């Protein structure tokens, strides 16, 4: 979702147009210099972009190169799918800030391109709050990574359907999902009510025969 | 040791020349394709490479790509210090890479396109898998330095305790923990914990500029 | 080396026991008189002593005064590290001190009073003189660290120049000076200066936390 | 003068009264703990105080111990002579600040006295403007040291009286002091006018026969 999204921009310098690859929350940015900006050139970056990390969706306000098929297509191989005021505000500014950064080392660099990357190195590296945006991406990603596997775990759990005794005497009530399994232990919710029960008490059914696995 | 360590190796390939990044624990790669090959040309990408991953050092099969001044020039901006069967594995990776490119080669007119795709495959390739990558590792590292710092802080402080029932006062000892009722510490071989009245812990000392 | 270095030595004297500070280049002393002698008691004054002069290390004739925990305790708050004919000169100083006290002894009922006076005499005693003291030395030191820092900064930076008329680019070289028209640098054995277009100087690199 | 002056105060803690020795410009402060405050005790500090550095004059708003002879007397052996709103404002505050500092490490120290010195160590040591007050004293002193010797040099120069030819033909005018001597070189001011002249042109007279030296 929002962790997946990255913001992409192109601005013109010395005629030559810069390639900008902002990360929406982490702010890690990858930018690249192409002798000429083209939808063609745009794609080459994207492949690497997906390669550094997965993006569900990427944003550009207008489509001059994105609309171009090679770009739309590239998005499909990645499966990245082309596209909050506060989030909105940061991007133009994000583009703006690097230039300011860029100017400082321009005298520092023979080649403007050589300079821009340096400009970017610092931006990821520069920082009492935060460890710098670049550091943030690794984390944001990390938390998500756990999440996804966990979600998957959750999904796995969701399928199975519970059988419960409750008191040893009572008539049965419709089956519920199982939150957790311990030996002699099960956790489920009949409707909204949560109860834990012993193994001999409850049998746990596999939800899917015929699964392709 | 391995974290923050990346390996780049010369690639011989049909047509244009490209070089591929390796982070050894992830095996992660961020290769780029260059029409012209010089360690220098290599540098521009490398400069891009460090930002995505701070890399402490790199070990090179060939001095010559390393020898070019500009290449060292990159090392310094980075503060990267060149790291003067595992290489065969990196090689194997390169090999794997080559194979991968081939599988998808038909799909793309341009070799470069293929290579990135190839990069993609190694990347996010299920297998506990390489694809998930070292991000978890980097995070653990991000977490790691602070702990190393806090412990280093605990290490920095010197705490002076008196064995209970002993007028003689015990030498400063590395403190394991601080508690308002009691703080835990080891002098060297023997570790003891005492109540606040029994011992005192200096606040700061000046060193390190 | 000598600046920031002070020597304290055990004093045997009539009545009460006092110990005297020495800064070797100044020969400056800030002795105090203690009814009870322990390295510990010594410490309270020492703690006072460091503030007036940061002292890096002290060399002691006797381990025992040094051995007491509290004494080491003082060393650490200071970050002072005990420094495990010149000693005879310090001794001579002590001797001189003793004599000095005697000259004025008659004037004062209390031995302590005399000693301070004695301290005063060594102090501000004309002779290029000790009395003017190391203050000039301390100042030069205060000035010194910043220069060592600025040079260290110049040392930190690496500058890359191309010999004029040479496509081959010269390895980074320690830069002696920066000029908008030209900057001065030495690679190692040979030192050359070039115009800004001929060479480039990286802005910063990251190291030292 | 003002470099010479130091500010001295006594405040009461735990009944016991602290001894405070502020430096007017440098702010370096020496303070000492006396089991009991007395004019007697006060003196002991002063001797050391003059000993660390010379003070022309020292300040206390009221005289309970200073008025005491032993204190006045002590001042004479040192030759220190007992006694600007901004300068005035800093002292009470100076006394106030250390206490705040003192409290922090009080838990740090078994003995309050042990603590106060530490409190002071920091105050001299703690610092983008300045190198910290303590560092300042060494400097302020240093500049003064040069000054005094220089003044002395000046005084030496002042005594001598100049004889000048000016043009080789002209009648002479009253003698002036000599600012500087170079071989074949002399600098003097006849009244307010400054002129430089050759040796053969001008003779330089020693100002004092009968000097005790
Ligand atoms: C085919 C192709 C193209 C594509 C190409 C390719 O070369 C590029 C340098 C443009 C990446 C290629 O090697 O095939 N080419 C050459 C095209 O002519 C083209 C035309 C229309 C749409 C896509 C491409 C563009 C892509 F970004 C892309 C792909 C496939 C994988 C996902 O990304
Ligand atoms: C300047 C420079 C150079 C360098 C350059 C630069 O342009 C490249 C296209 C080679 C990156 C530059 O913009 O100055 N150039 C042009 C040189 O001529 C050069 C010569 C000797 C050593 C380094 C460079 C090479 C580097 F690897 C490098 C840097 C700066 C950052 C750290 O790494
Ligand atoms: C605490 C302490 C001690 C210390 C003390 C202290 O009181 C003295 C009167 C001895 C200075 C204190 O106030 O705590 N005390 C009381 C101890 O009992 C003690 C025992 C072992 C080691 C040091 C001290 C000794 C020191 F040299 C010292 C310090 C702190 C600053 C650095 O130097
Ligand atoms: C005599 C004396 C006294 C003095 C003393 C002396 O002992 C002190 C501990 C008080 C310093 C001394 O050793 O003589 N004594 C003991 C007195 O009784 C006394 C009485 C009146 C005035 C001064 C002193 C006080 C001083 F601060 C002092 C001097 C002389 C040198 C300058 O300073």
Curated annotation (Swiss-Prot), chains A, D:
Integrase catalytic domain sequence ranges: 1-141
DNA-binding region, residue intervals: 160-207
Residues that, per the record, bind Mg(2+) 3: 9, 61, 92
Localization per record: Virion; Host nucleus; Host cytoplasm
Region forming the signal peptide: none
Domain notes: The core domain contains the D-x(n)-D-x(35)-E motif, named for the phylogenetically conserved glutamic acid and aspartic acid residues and the invariant 35 amino acid spacing between the second and third acidic residues. Each acidic residue of the D,D(35)E motif is independently essential for the 3'-processing and strand transfer activities of purified integrase protein.
Self-association state and partner proteins as the record states: Homotetramer; may further associate as a homohexadecamer. Part of the pre-integration complex (PIC) which is composed of viral genome, matrix protein, Vpr and integrase. Interacts with human SMARCB1/INI1 and human PSIP1/LEDGF isoform 1. Interacts with human KPNA3; this interaction might play a role in nuclear import of the pre-integration complex. Interacts with human NUP153; this interaction might play a role in nuclear import of the pre-integration complex.
Protein's job: Catalyzes viral DNA integration into the host chromosome, by performing a series of DNA cutting and joining reactions. This enzyme activity takes place after virion entry into a cell and reverse transcription of the RNA genome in dsDNA. The first step in the integration process is 3' processing. This step requires a complex comprising the viral genome, matrix protein, Vpr and integrase. This complex is called the pre-integration complex (PIC). The integrase protein removes 2 nucleotides from each 3' end of the viral DNA, leaving recessed CA OH's at the 3' ends.
UniProt protein name: Integrase
Organism: Human immunodeficiency virus type 1 group M subtype B (isolate NY5) (HIV-1)
